[PDB]
């Protein structure tokens, strides 16, 4: 069953990634950069890793009594 030994050996090889922060991708950064950039720029443009700040506006008004 070469299929099964293939599966188990590749599982043991991929789980061997504590040494490989990406497990030897050696590419796909040129696209991951754009993917995450677009994901950010559609979610927003601030530092989305920090706590949000909040400005609070207040409504307008007018004279109400008889002029």
């Amino acid at each position: 069953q070469k299929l099964f030994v293939d599966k188990i050996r590749e599982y043991k090889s991929k789980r061997q990634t504590s040494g490989g922060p990406v497990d030897a991708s050696s590419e796909y950064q040129q696209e991951l950069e754009r993917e995450l950039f677009k994901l950010k720029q559609m979610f927003g443009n601030a530092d989305m890793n920090t706590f949000p700040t909040f400005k609070f506006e207040d409504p307008k008004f007018e004279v109400i009594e008889k002029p």
């Binding site: 293939d6 590749e10 991929k14 990406v22 497990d23 030897a24 991708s25």
Partner: protein
């Protein structure tokens, strides 16, 4: 986070396949055995 869960899962799923390709007549004898049990 989940997107990275996908991007690395989709890359690790192809690497392992393009990796086993370089990897014995035991399979052929097994095929005749599999064919022997064909009935």
């Amino acid at each position: 986070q989940n997107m990275m869960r996908r991007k690395e899962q989709e890359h690790m799923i192809n690497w392992v396949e393009k990796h086993v390709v370089q990897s014995t007549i035991a399979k052929c004898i097994a095929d005749l055995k599999l064919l022997a049990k064909k009935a």
